[PDB]
């Protein structure tokens, strides 16, 4: 859990001000819980972490060298097109996960703010709209048989119109 990826803003919790003389069950109930649920489960997780610590193991995040793109890939040579298409699928999946991260970042803010989500949950909504625009420009109307070549055709069918707009 990297708090930069997942912000989780801080918590302004106030002081309990018991302006009365009648007790509060919740407090003694929480104490009883701490004593009869937390303590033993904590000890057990400590034991398990002990076994872990004494027989640790490490695993690495696989890196992927960059290969040529479709642009430098001839019109019928498949040894290159395979590499390029695999790379494109890889980046497509990573972009799926990026968008899912943004959405998981927006739901939390909505739930947190509550009735103030229309005023305090705006930069997240803006990031969402932006990444949505990007995902749409990259992958919206490709189809079930999507591929780097169709993405490239989309890019060019967009850029020619943008060029017309630029010149006039």
């Amino acid at each position: 859990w990297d708090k930069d990826v997942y912000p989780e803003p801080p918590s302004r919790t106030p002081a309990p001000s018991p302006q009365t003389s009648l007790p509060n069950p919740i407090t003694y109930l929480t104490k009883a819980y701490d004593l009869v649920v937390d303590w033993p489960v904590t000890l057990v997780r400590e034991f398990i972490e002990r076994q872990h610590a004494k027989n640790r193991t490490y695993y690495y995040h696989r890196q992927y060298r960059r290969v040529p793109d479709i642009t430098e890939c001839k019109e019928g040579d498949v040894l290159c097109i395979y590499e390029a298409e695999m790379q494109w699928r890889r980046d497509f999946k990573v972009d799926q996960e990026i968008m899912n991260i943004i959405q998981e970042r927006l739901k939390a803010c909505q739930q947190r703010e509550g009735e103030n989500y229309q005023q305090n949950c705006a930069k997240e909504l803006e990031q969402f709209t932006k990444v949505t625009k990007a995902y749409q420009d990259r992958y919206l109307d490709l189809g079930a048989y999507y591929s780097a070549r169709k993405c490239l055709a989309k890019q060019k069918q967009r850029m020619l119109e943008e060029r017309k707009a630029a010149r006039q």
Binding site: P25, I26, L29, T30, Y33, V37, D38, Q96, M99, N100, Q103, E104, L106, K107, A108, Q110, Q111, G114, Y117, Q118, L125, Y135
Partner: protein, 606 residues
């Protein structure tokens, strides 16, 4: 954040446990009813705590428990949204199902599959808790259909009765008609928001969102009972009184209203949805109460009254009072369950008769259920403080204090009077007249499994409105400024209904024959909605299915065209070419024609 979530999931673990013992071999060596009842009891005691912590802090939580799938930028997971609605409805429904399980262990003795009955009850309870605590439309749909199928399995308990099955299939049909709109809404949201979670969906407050709301409104008309899809609820009385009390007085029918309150952040800005609510819910308060004025069955009367109250809650939803609608949902269960409870007590005491025209003097031959029935009837009518007031008074004040439709504003109150009318009917024909029931008498209501549940639900029906209304937060400002003829209208009109009913019922005496009339015939035969719809629509659908598709298209024309035509063509050409007689003269003349044709082809094309 450890105690809250643990207490939220512990009730599910508990409710599940019985069904785990239902697959084990301990059933035949355990008292499954008592064990399940104790499980429900402890589940209620557990659910009581989150309620305290909320009433204190007013904090809601979202709890994602397990990752199910990841579909290309669309996750799906088990997500519980613990809020006011969920945490209060859970406690109410558990506190009720406790009483119902006890009364069921009493009422269903001599049934060998009482274990199966209890299992099905707890399964429905689990489905409803899913529906109620879902933070996701797919989970909510799971609960939806689980309720809809538990209804089929419980209405049908007596699978030899050829009418309980008709009722079950009726419910299935109407609820699928509602599922149509539910799925429409799910589709609209999945496309235009790439999500199914309340959180993201709440960012459509500026969008148009009229089609999904129409879909949800259809789904609510379906799961609840409104003039278009109502009849399946009365026909649900074909099942035992415990399920009539749980699935058809307190749960499985407030599901659409719960849907609409959950989606109130989007109905706040659509004066076409709020206006068809206000003009539909009121159309049921009147049309069912009318039906509840000339029926002779306690169960049908109670069901029509339930439908009327549901129309009232839809009315207060349309008038933009979702919290009030939910408060009514929660304060209605107590007495609309205790009423079915006393009904079933009276019935099992007698020889399985529900027709009020053959019972009387209950006020004296059965004090306990008579007292509890009177308490429930008063709470339903609106007696100033018996769990009816704290919701109905505010509803009937807002109804006239808001800018509304001036015909709904009238028929709503006419039905609010018909409430007291048919309640007085119950009271007078079941608890005030002479004993027109058979002569043999084996009454016995001295069993704790029957006395304690009703005592409990009655304490509820008396004090729940106080206990809640004085702890919940003020999510809406009411109008305590109005004339007396608006501040006292509900009470006054309930009293007038009681008096009119007294008069018209004492007229039942006086040796004046009862000349049938079309008004009463209409109210008795349900406005003929069933008697005509359930006869035309099947006939058309089925005569089409048979004479058109199966007969005309499949077994006739799609055969005549493709295969039969192929066979005919090839058999005919076969006959042509094999009609040959062994004549060398003819074979050689043909060879000569061939030679000529070939020579000509060559000499021509060249």
């Amino acid at each position: 954040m450890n105690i809250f979530t643990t207490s939220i999931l512990l009730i599910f673990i508990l409710l599940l446990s019985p069904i785990l013992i239902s697959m084990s071999n301990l059933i035949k060596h355990i008292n499954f009813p008592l064990y399940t009842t104790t499980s429900i009891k402890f589940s209620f005691i557990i659910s009581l705590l989150p309620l305290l912590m909320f009433f204190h802090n007013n904090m809601e939580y979202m709890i994602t428990t397990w990752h199910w799938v990841t579909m290309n930028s669309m996750e799906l997971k088990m997500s519980f949204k613990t809020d006011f609605f969920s945490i209060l409805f859970t406690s109410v429904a558990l506190f009720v199902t406790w009483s119902i399980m006890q009364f069921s262990s009493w009422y269903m003795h001599s049934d060998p599959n009482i274990n199966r009955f209890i299992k099905y009850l707890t399964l429905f309870l689990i489905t409803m808790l899913i529906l109620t605590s879902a933070n996701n439309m797919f989970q909510l749909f799971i609960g939806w259909e689980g309720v809809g199928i538990m209804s089929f399995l419980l209405i049908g308990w007596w699978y030899g009765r050829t009418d309980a099955n008709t009722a079950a299939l009726q419910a299935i049909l109407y609820n699928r008609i509602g599922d149509i709109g539910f799925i429409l809404a799910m589709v609209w949201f999945s496309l235009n928001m790439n999500s199914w979670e309340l959180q993201q969906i709440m960012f459509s407050n500026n969008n148009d969102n009229l089609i999904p709301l129409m879909g949800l409104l259809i789904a609510a008309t379906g799961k609840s009972a409104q003039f278009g899809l109502h009849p399946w609820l009365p026909s649900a009385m074909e099942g035992p009184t415990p399920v009539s009390a749980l699935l058809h007085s307190s749960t499985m029918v407030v599901a659409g209203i719960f849907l609409l309150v959950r989606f109130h952040p989007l109905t706040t800005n659509n004066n076409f949805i709020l206006t068809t609510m206000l003009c539909l819910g009121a159309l049921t308060t009147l049309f069912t109460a009318i039906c509840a004025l000339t029926q002779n069955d306690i169960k049908k009367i109670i069901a029509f009254s339930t439908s009327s109250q549901l129309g009232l809650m839809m009315v207060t939803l349309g008038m933009n009072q979702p919290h009030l609608a939910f408060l009514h949902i929660c304060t209605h269960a107590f007495f609309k369950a205790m009423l079915f409870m006393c009904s079933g007590s009276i019935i099992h005491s007698l020889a399985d008769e529900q027709d009020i025209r053959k019972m009387g003097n209950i006020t004296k031959i059965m004090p306990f259920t008579s007292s509890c029935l009177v308490i429930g009837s008063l709470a339903l009518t609106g007696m100033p403080f018996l769990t009816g007031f704290y919701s109905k008074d505010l509803i009937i004040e807002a109804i006239n204090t808001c800018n509304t439709n001036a015909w709904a504003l009238l028929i709503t109150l006419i039905a609010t009077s018909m409430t007291a009318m048919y309640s007085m009917r119950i009271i007078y024909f079941v608890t005030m007249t002479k004993p027109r029931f058979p002569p043999l008498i084996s009454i016995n209501e001295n069993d704790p499994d029957l006395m304690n549940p009703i005592k409990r639900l009655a304490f509820g029906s008396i004090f729940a409105g106080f206990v809640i209304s004085y702890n919940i937060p003020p999510t809406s400002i009411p109008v305590l400024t109005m004339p007396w003829f608006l501040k006292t209208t509900a009470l006054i009109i309930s009293v007038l209904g009681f008096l009119i009913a007294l008069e018209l019922n004492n007229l039942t005496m006086k040796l004046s024959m009862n000349k049938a009339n079309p008004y009463s015939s209409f109210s008795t035969l349900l406005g003929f909605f069933p008697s005509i719809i359930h006869r035309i629509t099947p006939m058309k659908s089925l005569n089409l299915s048979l004479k058109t598709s199966l007969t005309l298209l499949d077994l006739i024309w799609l055969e005549k065209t493709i295969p039969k035509s192929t066979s005919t063509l090839h058999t005919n050409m076969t006959t042509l070419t094999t009609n040959q007689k062994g004549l060398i003269k003819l074979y050689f003349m043909s060879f000569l024609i061939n030679i000529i044709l070939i020579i000509i082809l060559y000499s021509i094309n060249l």
